[PDB]
Amino acid sequence: TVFRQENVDDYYDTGEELGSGKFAVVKKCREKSTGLQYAAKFIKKRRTKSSRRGVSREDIEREVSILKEIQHPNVITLHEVYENKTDVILILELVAGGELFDFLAEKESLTEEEATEFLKQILNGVYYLHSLQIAHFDLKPENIMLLDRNVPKPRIKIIDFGLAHKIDFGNEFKNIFGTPEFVAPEIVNYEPLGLEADMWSIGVITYILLSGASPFLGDTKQETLANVSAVNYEFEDEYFSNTSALAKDFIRRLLVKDPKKRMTIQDSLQHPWIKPQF
């Protein structure tokens, strides 16, 4: 698929830097014709077929097609796509309240109500994605953004579809590996992956929301991954003593090694706590 090859600077003005990783940088921007503001994600292209630097065209096209399919209040919205020799530039919905990661760092520990208020929005967004057989594969606090961080109950959107895949055969067996603290045992063990991997990541995020602590984190990436594969976590009394037993039940049913026995997204919405790298 070919994207718009006009110079993005003829149509947008860029400003503050919003985010960035290994091969992408995100800048706030404003569309000249409308005055509307967006987030421009500049993704570095591969320079040669066999290179390891940059993102492959196949990977870029897959993220773009996924983004084009989705429209839901709890997921980011793609506006348009440009490209040049060096980058593909995705013009995305601007989510200006920052990462849930930074919100959690800056603020005092969360109440169980504040935690579920964020969690319910994540579950609604993942329910939408899983309904379309889209596995995100990289759910974590850095990939959840707030619309406005100063309201008591901030609204959120899931972002960064760079590892997302359509799962039309129940599972995918590709080069797919996210951030060690959040990946499921099947990712760690290089086994076929499905929607279940997202549900594990949800359990990890829930544990962090309630406690401020990461359940599998070790002193090195290998220790984290070893802990994930062995399901080596526990609910520390110091962190969980006033957390309800039903909250712990929820996490327990997600942090399950066998993907077949793990709660699905529909199970998670019916659960009594909720129901109304080298």
PDB file of C-alpha atoms in Angstrom:
ATOM      1  CA  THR A   1       0.000   0.000   0.000  1.00  0.00           C
ATOM      2  CA  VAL A   2       1.299   3.453  -0.938  1.00  0.00           C
ATOM      3  CA  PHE A   3       0.797   6.500   1.303  1.00  0.00           C
ATOM      4  CA  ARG A   4       0.661  10.292   0.679  1.00  0.00           C
ATOM      5  CA  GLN A   5       4.035  11.444  -0.639  1.00  0.00           C
ATOM      6  CA  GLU A   6       3.613  15.233  -0.327  1.00  0.00           C
ATOM      7  CA  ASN A   7       5.828  16.865   2.305  1.00  0.00           C
ATOM      8  CA  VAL A   8       3.993  16.657   5.621  1.00  0.00           C
ATOM      9  CA  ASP A   9       5.304  20.155   6.470  1.00  0.00           C
ATOM     10  CA  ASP A  10       3.174  21.616   3.655  1.00  0.00           C
ATOM     11  CA  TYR A  11       0.069  20.540   5.592  1.00  0.00           C
ATOM     12  CA  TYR A  12       1.025  20.446   9.282  1.00  0.00           C
ATOM     13  CA  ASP A  13       3.130  22.429  11.730  1.00  0.00           C
ATOM     14  CA  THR A  14       4.837  20.362  14.457  1.00  0.00           C
ATOM     15  CA  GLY A  15       5.493  21.329  18.083  1.00  0.00           C
ATOM     16  CA  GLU A  16       6.177  19.644  21.393  1.00  0.00           C
ATOM     17  CA  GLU A  17       7.559  16.101  21.444  1.00  0.00           C
ATOM     18  CA  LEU A  18       5.041  13.693  22.979  1.00  0.00           C
ATOM     19  CA  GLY A  19       6.809  10.354  22.955  1.00  0.00           C
ATOM     20  CA  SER A  20       9.303   8.052  21.281  1.00  0.00           C
ATOM     21  CA  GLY A  21      10.900   4.641  21.200  1.00  0.00           C
ATOM     22  CA  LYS A  22      13.506   2.629  19.335  1.00  0.00           C
ATOM     23  CA  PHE A  23      12.323   3.478  15.779  1.00  0.00           C
ATOM     24  CA  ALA A  24       9.598   6.159  16.248  1.00  0.00           C
ATOM     25  CA  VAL A  25       9.141   9.657  17.625  1.00  0.00           C
ATOM     26  CA  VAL A  26       5.789  11.365  18.233  1.00  0.00           C
ATOM     27  CA  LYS A  27       5.335  15.137  17.897  1.00  0.00           C
ATOM     28  CA  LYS A  28       2.278  17.289  18.553  1.00  0.00           C
ATOM     29  CA  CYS A  29       1.101  18.916  15.339  1.00  0.00           C
ATOM     30  CA  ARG A  30      -1.552  21.205  13.900  1.00  0.00           C
ATOM     31  CA  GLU A  31      -3.287  20.836  10.530  1.00  0.00           C
ATOM     32  CA  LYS A  32      -2.916  24.077   8.543  1.00  0.00           C
ATOM     33  CA  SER A  33      -6.287  23.796   6.768  1.00  0.00           C
ATOM     34  CA  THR A  34      -8.486  23.168   9.880  1.00  0.00           C
ATOM     35  CA  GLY A  35      -6.494  24.261  12.958  1.00  0.00           C
ATOM     36  CA  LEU A  36      -7.112  20.837  14.467  1.00  0.00           C
ATOM     37  CA  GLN A  37      -4.389  19.201  16.495  1.00  0.00           C
ATOM     38  CA  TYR A  38      -3.010  15.683  16.183  1.00  0.00           C
ATOM     39  CA  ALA A  39      -0.065  13.541  17.120  1.00  0.00           C
ATOM     40  CA  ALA A  40       2.365  12.783  14.268  1.00  0.00           C
ATOM     41  CA  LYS A  41       4.233   9.491  14.738  1.00  0.00           C
ATOM     42  CA  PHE A  42       7.351   9.340  12.536  1.00  0.00           C
ATOM     43  CA  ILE A  43       8.348   5.666  11.991  1.00  0.00           C
ATOM     44  CA  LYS A  44      11.838   5.001  10.566  1.00  0.00           C
ATOM     45  CA  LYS A  45      11.846   2.850   7.444  1.00  0.00           C
ATOM     46  CA  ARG A  46      14.314   0.034   6.765  1.00  0.00           C
ATOM     47  CA  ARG A  47      17.144   1.090   4.414  1.00  0.00           C
ATOM     48  CA  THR A  48      17.760  -2.427   3.006  1.00  0.00           C
ATOM     49  CA  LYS A  49      15.932  -5.734   2.897  1.00  0.00           C
ATOM     50  CA  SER A  50      18.215  -7.479   5.425  1.00  0.00           C
ATOM     51  CA  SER A  51      18.798  -4.594   7.845  1.00  0.00           C
ATOM     52  CA  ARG A  52      17.826  -4.700  11.542  1.00  0.00           C
ATOM     53  CA  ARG A  53      17.535  -0.915  11.866  1.00  0.00           C
ATOM     54  CA  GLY A  54      14.137   0.598  11.078  1.00  0.00           C
ATOM     55  CA  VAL A  55      10.735  -0.989  10.757  1.00  0.00           C
ATOM     56  CA  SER A  56       9.985  -3.315   7.823  1.00  0.00           C
ATOM     57  CA  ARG A  57       7.327  -2.249   5.347  1.00  0.00           C
ATOM     58  CA  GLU A  58       5.277  -5.336   6.182  1.00  0.00           C
ATOM     59  CA  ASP A  59       5.259  -4.309   9.891  1.00  0.00           C
ATOM     60  CA  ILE A  60       4.298  -0.699   9.051  1.00  0.00           C
ATOM     61  CA  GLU A  61       1.510  -1.750   6.698  1.00  0.00           C
ATOM     62  CA  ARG A  62       0.099  -4.133   9.326  1.00  0.00           C
ATOM     63  CA  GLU A  63      -0.046  -1.403  12.022  1.00  0.00           C
ATOM     64  CA  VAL A  64      -1.691   0.957   9.505  1.00  0.00           C
ATOM     65  CA  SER A  65      -4.340  -1.544   8.369  1.00  0.00           C
ATOM     66  CA  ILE A  66      -5.189  -2.369  11.992  1.00  0.00           C
ATOM     67  CA  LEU A  67      -5.468   1.290  12.844  1.00  0.00           C
ATOM     68  CA  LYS A  68      -7.735   1.875   9.839  1.00  0.00           C
ATOM     69  CA  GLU A  69     -10.191  -0.782  11.022  1.00  0.00           C
ATOM     70  CA  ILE A  70     -10.774   0.545  14.550  1.00  0.00           C
ATOM     71  CA  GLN A  71     -13.092   3.233  15.942  1.00  0.00           C
ATOM     72  CA  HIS A  72     -13.926   3.178  19.606  1.00  0.00           C
ATOM     73  CA  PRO A  73     -13.736   5.754  22.436  1.00  0.00           C
ATOM     74  CA  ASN A  74     -11.039   3.716  24.194  1.00  0.00           C
ATOM     75  CA  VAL A  75      -8.663   3.256  21.248  1.00  0.00           C
ATOM     76  CA  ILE A  76      -6.590   5.760  19.276  1.00  0.00           C
ATOM     77  CA  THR A  77      -7.980   7.033  15.877  1.00  0.00           C
ATOM     78  CA  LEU A  78      -5.783   7.260  12.695  1.00  0.00           C
ATOM     79  CA  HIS A  79      -6.391  10.463  10.653  1.00  0.00           C
ATOM     80  CA  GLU A  80      -4.032  10.042   7.723  1.00  0.00           C
ATOM     81  CA  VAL A  81      -0.700   8.592   6.620  1.00  0.00           C
ATOM     82  CA  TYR A  82       2.230  10.208   4.763  1.00  0.00           C
ATOM     83  CA  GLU A  83       5.596   8.807   3.769  1.00  0.00           C
ATOM     84  CA  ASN A  84       8.953   9.802   2.351  1.00  0.00           C
ATOM     85  CA  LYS A  85      12.266   8.075   1.733  1.00  0.00           C
ATOM     86  CA  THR A  86      13.128   7.842   5.442  1.00  0.00           C
ATOM     87  CA  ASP A  87       9.853   7.631   7.368  1.00  0.00           C
ATOM     88  CA  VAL A  88       6.170   6.718   7.365  1.00  0.00           C
ATOM     89  CA  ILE A  89       4.305   9.404   9.301  1.00  0.00           C
ATOM     90  CA  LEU A  90       1.012   8.485  10.967  1.00  0.00           C
ATOM     91  CA  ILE A  91      -1.198  11.401  11.850  1.00  0.00           C
ATOM     92  CA  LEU A  92      -3.019  10.117  14.964  1.00  0.00           C
ATOM     93  CA  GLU A  93      -5.598  11.410  17.388  1.00  0.00           C
ATOM     94  CA  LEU A  94      -3.958  13.667  19.972  1.00  0.00           C
ATOM     95  CA  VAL A  95      -4.275  12.333  23.522  1.00  0.00           C
ATOM     96  CA  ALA A  96      -2.874  15.168  25.603  1.00  0.00           C
ATOM     97  CA  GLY A  97      -3.072  13.931  29.231  1.00  0.00           C
ATOM     98  CA  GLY A  98       0.116  11.854  29.090  1.00  0.00           C
ATOM     99  CA  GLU A  99       0.785   8.191  29.777  1.00  0.00           C
ATOM    100  CA  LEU A 100      -0.949   6.280  32.490  1.00  0.00           C
ATOM    101  CA  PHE A 101       2.633   5.322  33.446  1.00  0.00           C
ATOM    102  CA  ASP A 102       3.508   8.942  34.358  1.00  0.00           C
ATOM    103  CA  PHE A 103       0.157   9.553  36.076  1.00  0.00           C
ATOM    104  CA  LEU A 104       0.800   6.553  38.325  1.00  0.00           C
ATOM    105  CA  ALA A 105       4.322   7.725  39.099  1.00  0.00           C
ATOM    106  CA  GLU A 106       3.359  11.318  39.898  1.00  0.00           C
ATOM    107  CA  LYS A 107       0.362  10.483  42.046  1.00  0.00           C
ATOM    108  CA  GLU A 108      -0.310   8.872  45.406  1.00  0.00           C
ATOM    109  CA  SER A 109      -1.336   5.177  45.423  1.00  0.00           C
ATOM    110  CA  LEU A 110      -4.766   4.439  43.813  1.00  0.00           C
ATOM    111  CA  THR A 111      -7.978   3.405  45.587  1.00  0.00           C
ATOM    112  CA  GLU A 112      -9.719   0.238  44.395  1.00  0.00           C
ATOM    113  CA  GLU A 113     -12.423   2.463  42.810  1.00  0.00           C
ATOM    114  CA  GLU A 114      -9.826   4.594  40.915  1.00  0.00           C
ATOM    115  CA  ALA A 115      -8.106   1.397  39.744  1.00  0.00           C
ATOM    116  CA  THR A 116     -11.372  -0.174  38.458  1.00  0.00           C
ATOM    117  CA  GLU A 117     -12.370   3.098  36.768  1.00  0.00           C
ATOM    118  CA  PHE A 118      -9.229   2.877  34.611  1.00  0.00           C
ATOM    119  CA  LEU A 119      -9.496  -0.907  34.300  1.00  0.00           C
ATOM    120  CA  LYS A 120     -13.114  -0.852  33.035  1.00  0.00           C
ATOM    121  CA  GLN A 121     -12.102   1.494  30.201  1.00  0.00           C
ATOM    122  CA  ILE A 122      -9.187  -0.755  29.269  1.00  0.00           C
ATOM    123  CA  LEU A 123     -11.490  -3.802  29.327  1.00  0.00           C
ATOM    124  CA  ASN A 124     -14.009  -2.017  27.128  1.00  0.00           C
ATOM    125  CA  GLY A 125     -11.265  -1.112  24.594  1.00  0.00           C
ATOM    126  CA  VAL A 126      -9.851  -4.681  24.634  1.00  0.00           C
ATOM    127  CA  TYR A 127     -13.393  -6.113  24.317  1.00  0.00           C
ATOM    128  CA  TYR A 128     -13.758  -4.065  21.100  1.00  0.00           C
ATOM    129  CA  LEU A 129     -10.351  -5.205  19.748  1.00  0.00           C
ATOM    130  CA  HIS A 130     -10.838  -8.891  20.616  1.00  0.00           C
ATOM    131  CA  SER A 131     -14.297  -8.778  19.043  1.00  0.00           C
ATOM    132  CA  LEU A 132     -12.490  -7.863  15.796  1.00  0.00           C
ATOM    133  CA  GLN A 133      -9.933 -10.670  16.461  1.00  0.00           C
ATOM    134  CA  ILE A 134      -7.187  -8.040  17.035  1.00  0.00           C
ATOM    135  CA  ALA A 135      -4.540  -8.939  19.655  1.00  0.00           C
ATOM    136  CA  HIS A 136      -2.666  -5.815  20.757  1.00  0.00           C
ATOM    137  CA  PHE A 137       0.343  -7.750  22.162  1.00  0.00           C
ATOM    138  CA  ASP A 138       1.890  -4.737  23.920  1.00  0.00           C
ATOM    139  CA  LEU A 139      -0.587  -3.661  26.664  1.00  0.00           C
ATOM    140  CA  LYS A 140       1.221  -1.793  29.514  1.00  0.00           C
ATOM    141  CA  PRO A 141       0.818   1.566  31.384  1.00  0.00           C
ATOM    142  CA  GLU A 142       3.114   3.374  28.881  1.00  0.00           C
ATOM    143  CA  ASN A 143       0.632   2.397  26.074  1.00  0.00           C
ATOM    144  CA  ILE A 144      -2.434   3.803  27.817  1.00  0.00           C
ATOM    145  CA  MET A 145      -2.901   7.596  27.482  1.00  0.00           C
ATOM    146  CA  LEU A 146      -5.193   9.963  29.343  1.00  0.00           C
ATOM    147  CA  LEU A 147      -7.428  12.461  27.530  1.00  0.00           C
ATOM    148  CA  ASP A 148      -7.283  14.915  30.485  1.00  0.00           C
ATOM    149  CA  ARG A 149      -5.242  14.121  33.580  1.00  0.00           C
ATOM    150  CA  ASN A 150      -6.878  16.765  35.892  1.00  0.00           C
ATOM    151  CA  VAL A 151     -10.400  15.302  36.140  1.00  0.00           C
ATOM    152  CA  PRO A 152     -11.090  12.932  39.087  1.00  0.00           C
ATOM    153  CA  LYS A 153     -11.810   9.942  36.757  1.00  0.00           C
ATOM    154  CA  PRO A 154      -9.529  10.385  33.709  1.00  0.00           C
ATOM    155  CA  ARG A 155     -10.686   8.892  30.369  1.00  0.00           C
ATOM    156  CA  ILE A 156      -8.169   6.759  28.536  1.00  0.00           C
ATOM    157  CA  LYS A 157      -7.196   5.438  25.101  1.00  0.00           C
ATOM    158  CA  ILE A 158      -5.111   2.436  24.186  1.00  0.00           C
ATOM    159  CA  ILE A 159      -2.175   3.347  21.926  1.00  0.00           C
ATOM    160  CA  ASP A 160       0.793   1.837  20.009  1.00  0.00           C
ATOM    161  CA  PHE A 161      -0.500  -0.837  17.679  1.00  0.00           C
ATOM    162  CA  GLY A 162       3.065  -1.623  16.464  1.00  0.00           C
ATOM    163  CA  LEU A 163       2.895  -5.281  17.604  1.00  0.00           C
ATOM    164  CA  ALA A 164      -0.835  -5.792  16.967  1.00  0.00           C
ATOM    165  CA  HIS A 165      -2.010  -8.725  14.806  1.00  0.00           C
ATOM    166  CA  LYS A 166      -5.293 -10.028  13.354  1.00  0.00           C
ATOM    167  CA  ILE A 167      -5.812 -13.576  14.730  1.00  0.00           C
ATOM    168  CA  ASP A 168      -8.080 -15.214  12.173  1.00  0.00           C
ATOM    169  CA  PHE A 169      -6.861 -18.776  12.914  1.00  0.00           C
ATOM    170  CA  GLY A 170      -7.067 -18.661  16.750  1.00  0.00           C
ATOM    171  CA  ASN A 171      -3.294 -18.145  17.038  1.00  0.00           C
ATOM    172  CA  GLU A 172      -0.262 -16.593  15.285  1.00  0.00           C
ATOM    173  CA  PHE A 173       3.301 -17.883  15.249  1.00  0.00           C
ATOM    174  CA  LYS A 174       5.587 -14.994  14.376  1.00  0.00           C
ATOM    175  CA  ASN A 175       8.412 -12.894  15.768  1.00  0.00           C
ATOM    176  CA  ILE A 176       6.352 -11.226  18.477  1.00  0.00           C
ATOM    177  CA  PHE A 177       7.809 -10.216  21.827  1.00  0.00           C
ATOM    178  CA  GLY A 178       6.892  -7.225  24.017  1.00  0.00           C
ATOM    179  CA  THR A 179       8.215  -5.747  27.259  1.00  0.00           C
ATOM    180  CA  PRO A 180       9.395  -8.508  29.656  1.00  0.00           C
ATOM    181  CA  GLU A 181       7.391  -7.318  32.689  1.00  0.00           C
ATOM    182  CA  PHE A 182       4.092  -7.599  30.792  1.00  0.00           C
ATOM    183  CA  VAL A 183       4.489 -10.527  28.433  1.00  0.00           C
ATOM    184  CA  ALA A 184       2.632 -13.824  28.940  1.00  0.00           C
ATOM    185  CA  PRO A 185       4.436 -17.168  29.475  1.00  0.00           C
ATOM    186  CA  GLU A 186       3.566 -18.216  25.888  1.00  0.00           C
ATOM    187  CA  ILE A 187       5.480 -15.160  24.580  1.00  0.00           C
ATOM    188  CA  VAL A 188       8.447 -16.027  26.804  1.00  0.00           C
ATOM    189  CA  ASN A 189       8.400 -19.680  25.615  1.00  0.00           C
ATOM    190  CA  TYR A 190       7.978 -18.751  21.902  1.00  0.00           C
ATOM    191  CA  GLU A 191       4.709 -20.628  21.537  1.00  0.00           C
ATOM    192  CA  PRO A 192       1.758 -19.752  19.216  1.00  0.00           C
ATOM    193  CA  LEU A 193      -0.036 -16.647  20.490  1.00  0.00           C
ATOM    194  CA  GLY A 194      -3.686 -15.566  20.556  1.00  0.00           C
ATOM    195  CA  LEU A 195      -5.991 -13.102  22.296  1.00  0.00           C
ATOM    196  CA  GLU A 196      -5.167 -14.765  25.631  1.00  0.00           C
ATOM    197  CA  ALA A 197      -1.753 -13.019  25.808  1.00  0.00           C
ATOM    198  CA  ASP A 198      -3.544  -9.663  26.172  1.00  0.00           C
ATOM    199  CA  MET A 199      -5.542 -11.025  29.104  1.00  0.00           C
ATOM    200  CA  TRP A 200      -2.343 -11.887  30.963  1.00  0.00           C
ATOM    201  CA  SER A 201      -1.031  -8.313  30.369  1.00  0.00           C
ATOM    202  CA  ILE A 202      -4.311  -7.054  31.848  1.00  0.00           C
ATOM    203  CA  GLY A 203      -3.646  -9.086  35.041  1.00  0.00           C
ATOM    204  CA  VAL A 204      -0.198  -7.472  35.316  1.00  0.00           C
ATOM    205  CA  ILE A 205      -1.577  -3.986  34.761  1.00  0.00           C
ATOM    206  CA  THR A 206      -4.281  -4.647  37.397  1.00  0.00           C
ATOM    207  CA  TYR A 207      -1.686  -5.804  39.937  1.00  0.00           C
ATOM    208  CA  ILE A 208       0.331  -2.585  39.318  1.00  0.00           C
ATOM    209  CA  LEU A 209      -2.750  -0.324  39.521  1.00  0.00           C
ATOM    210  CA  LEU A 210      -3.688  -1.702  42.936  1.00  0.00           C
ATOM    211  CA  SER A 211      -0.236  -1.928  44.504  1.00  0.00           C
ATOM    212  CA  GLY A 212       2.262   0.274  42.681  1.00  0.00           C
ATOM    213  CA  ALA A 213       4.493  -2.818  42.376  1.00  0.00           C
ATOM    214  CA  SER A 214       5.291  -5.073  39.362  1.00  0.00           C
ATOM    215  CA  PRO A 215       4.488  -8.752  40.041  1.00  0.00           C
ATOM    216  CA  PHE A 216       7.260 -10.465  38.023  1.00  0.00           C
ATOM    217  CA  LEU A 217       9.983  -7.826  37.870  1.00  0.00           C
ATOM    218  CA  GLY A 218      13.512  -9.057  38.581  1.00  0.00           C
ATOM    219  CA  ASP A 219      16.912  -7.301  38.616  1.00  0.00           C
ATOM    220  CA  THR A 220      17.565  -8.239  34.960  1.00  0.00           C
ATOM    221  CA  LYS A 221      15.427  -8.948  31.864  1.00  0.00           C
ATOM    222  CA  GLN A 222      16.284 -12.678  32.084  1.00  0.00           C
ATOM    223  CA  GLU A 223      15.141 -12.891  35.712  1.00  0.00           C
ATOM    224  CA  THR A 224      11.835 -11.132  34.782  1.00  0.00           C
ATOM    225  CA  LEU A 225      11.205 -13.571  31.934  1.00  0.00           C
ATOM    226  CA  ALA A 226      12.112 -16.566  34.117  1.00  0.00           C
ATOM    227  CA  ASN A 227       9.670 -15.359  36.762  1.00  0.00           C
ATOM    228  CA  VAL A 228       6.901 -14.907  34.169  1.00  0.00           C
ATOM    229  CA  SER A 229       7.351 -18.439  32.804  1.00  0.00           C
ATOM    230  CA  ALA A 230       7.263 -19.977  36.292  1.00  0.00           C
ATOM    231  CA  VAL A 231       4.306 -17.725  37.361  1.00  0.00           C
ATOM    232  CA  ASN A 232       6.536 -16.565  40.231  1.00  0.00           C
ATOM    233  CA  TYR A 233       4.454 -13.828  41.867  1.00  0.00           C
ATOM    234  CA  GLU A 234       2.557 -13.342  45.103  1.00  0.00           C
ATOM    235  CA  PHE A 235       0.349 -10.724  46.712  1.00  0.00           C
ATOM    236  CA  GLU A 236       2.619  -8.975  49.235  1.00  0.00           C
ATOM    237  CA  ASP A 237       0.691  -8.168  52.451  1.00  0.00           C
ATOM    238  CA  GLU A 238       2.501  -4.794  52.749  1.00  0.00           C
ATOM    239  CA  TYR A 239       0.992  -3.760  49.411  1.00  0.00           C
ATOM    240  CA  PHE A 240      -2.269  -5.704  49.364  1.00  0.00           C
ATOM    241  CA  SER A 241      -3.491  -5.769  53.042  1.00  0.00           C
ATOM    242  CA  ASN A 242      -6.463  -3.455  52.350  1.00  0.00           C
ATOM    243  CA  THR A 243      -7.153  -4.773  48.834  1.00  0.00           C
ATOM    244  CA  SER A 244     -10.329  -6.862  48.607  1.00  0.00           C
ATOM    245  CA  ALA A 245     -10.142 -10.605  48.179  1.00  0.00           C
ATOM    246  CA  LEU A 246     -12.311 -10.275  45.052  1.00  0.00           C
ATOM    247  CA  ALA A 247      -9.682  -7.958  43.419  1.00  0.00           C
ATOM    248  CA  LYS A 248      -7.057 -10.600  44.101  1.00  0.00           C
ATOM    249  CA  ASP A 249      -9.394 -13.302  42.685  1.00  0.00           C
ATOM    250  CA  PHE A 250      -9.638 -11.256  39.453  1.00  0.00           C
ATOM    251  CA  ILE A 251      -5.845 -11.054  39.079  1.00  0.00           C
ATOM    252  CA  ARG A 252      -5.388 -14.702  39.976  1.00  0.00           C
ATOM    253  CA  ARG A 253      -7.690 -15.854  37.175  1.00  0.00           C
ATOM    254  CA  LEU A 254      -5.685 -13.799  34.603  1.00  0.00           C
ATOM    255  CA  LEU A 255      -2.166 -14.715  35.781  1.00  0.00           C
ATOM    256  CA  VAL A 256      -2.597 -18.360  34.679  1.00  0.00           C
ATOM    257  CA  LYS A 257       0.084 -20.137  32.655  1.00  0.00           C
ATOM    258  CA  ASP A 258      -2.246 -22.272  30.515  1.00  0.00           C
ATOM    259  CA  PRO A 259      -3.841 -19.837  28.020  1.00  0.00           C
ATOM    260  CA  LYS A 260      -6.881 -22.115  27.760  1.00  0.00           C
ATOM    261  CA  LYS A 261      -7.653 -21.759  31.453  1.00  0.00           C
ATOM    262  CA  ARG A 262      -7.162 -18.009  31.630  1.00  0.00           C
ATOM    263  CA  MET A 263     -10.142 -15.629  31.796  1.00  0.00           C
ATOM    264  CA  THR A 264     -11.236 -14.268  28.397  1.00  0.00           C
ATOM    265  CA  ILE A 265     -12.234 -10.616  27.899  1.00  0.00           C
ATOM    266  CA  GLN A 266     -15.916 -11.586  28.174  1.00  0.00           C
ATOM    267  CA  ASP A 267     -15.153 -13.551  31.391  1.00  0.00           C
ATOM    268  CA  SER A 268     -13.378 -10.458  32.790  1.00  0.00           C
ATOM    269  CA  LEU A 269     -16.449  -8.234  32.166  1.00  0.00           C
ATOM    270  CA  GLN A 270     -18.703 -10.759  33.994  1.00  0.00           C
ATOM    271  CA  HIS A 271     -16.330 -11.277  36.929  1.00  0.00           C
ATOM    272  CA  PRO A 272     -18.036 -10.224  40.207  1.00  0.00           C
ATOM    273  CA  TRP A 273     -15.339  -7.544  40.860  1.00  0.00           C
ATOM    274  CA  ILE A 274     -16.232  -5.785  37.584  1.00  0.00           C
ATOM    275  CA  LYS A 275     -19.865  -6.678  36.726  1.00  0.00           C
ATOM    276  CA  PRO A 276     -22.258  -3.832  37.643  1.00  0.00           C
ATOM    277  CA  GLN A 277      14.032  -9.016  24.809  1.00  0.00           C
ATOM    278  CA  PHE A 278      17.809  -9.235  25.210  1.00  0.00           C
TER     279      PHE A 278
END
